[PDB]
């Protein structure tokens with residue numbers, strides 16, 4: 001039985017020997033540094049009395065990924081003021097009110113809120129929806145736009161039914177119940193598959209969609225079994241509906257193990273912790289940890305999914321270490337305990353490239369301390 005059923009969350013820092021007091025203080029200090037820390041560390045920026053944004057420091061823009069991530073961190077840390085500032089920014093600047101992307105979020109904008117491209121990123125929408133559901137269950141709905149439950153249901157309605165509103169496209173392929181890379185293209189991104197959120201969407205979404213969301217959960221668990229390499233546990237950034245690496249795209253080669261794919265190990269580990277439904281998840285977690293067991297974080301490269309290293313370094317090696325450590329929620333192999341310790345002894349990244357590493361870092365600090373939880377009712 002998973003944490004969803006028992007209400008009990010594994011505290012791997014505690015199982016590993018760290019003191020309860022040290023752990024809570026470490027989690028609180030990670031929060032403080034990321035949202036209120038110095039100019040070289042923080043990724044959160046207040047705007048006026050009622051807005052705020054998560055900065056992709058590397059790309060000097062605001063992404064629906066980072067906004068939705070900041071809202072999830074805020075609600076897991078019971079930080080309503082920051083949650084509300086981030087949501088208000090997303091609601092005000094990013095969410096489309098009309099046209100083919102109505103109720104979707106523009107995937108990126110300038111920090112001042114000027115939209116840069118209208119197209120959405122589905123991993124944004126699914127985190128917004130999950131964070132808003134948790135906000136409703138934790139704090140209760142307020143007047144619009146802080147009517148969190150209805151806001152979540154509106155996003156997930158468009159996610160399944162955009163094709164019916166007019167000229168747009170849904171973010172899930174109805175034929176196979178799989179999340180797409182973008183609404184228009186017939187392939188996926190394995191790091192976007194969050195079967196554990198789809199279980200909760202099957203409880204909290206519009207009644208007419210609950211059957212679909214339950215099928216989506218089972219379809220996504222099956223899909224990650226097809227996308228992950230059976231020796232190395234590595235996955236491609238973009239994958240076909242059959243799990244094989246998708247073709248090279250006009251904007252680059254996403255066939256290999258790089259930044260997006262790091263989140264797969266994290267996502268499978270949290271589904272195991274919450275729902276304990278697919279025991280392949282334990283072996284997948286053991287495999288990826290075995291793959292990285294004897295590789296220094298400063299040596300992390302881009303890899304083919306069969307594990308052939310490129311000369312090129314990982315752009316986000318702290319992010320990769322974080323997802324590898326988060327796999328300890330599921331792994332029972334000889335490497336779980338050492339990745340937990342390696343992570344504990346790793347500080348937040350600083351400087352221009354810090355955004356992505358520090359997002360993945362925080363989700364791991366939450367998870368390994370037993371604080372990445374389902375908020376029900």
Ligand SMILES: O[C@@H]1[C@@H](O)[C@H](O)OC[C@H]1O
Pocket residue numbers: 063064065107121123260
């Ligand atoms: O996770 C996606 C990421 O790869 C992209 O660069 O920006 C945010 C999302 O579209």
Ligand SMILES: O[C@@H]1[C@@H](O)[C@H](O)OC[C@H]1O
Pocket residue numbers: 056058059063065259260315355356
């Ligand atoms: O937004 C992310 C970007 O900041 C990172 O550098 O590459 C992966 C993207 O998802």
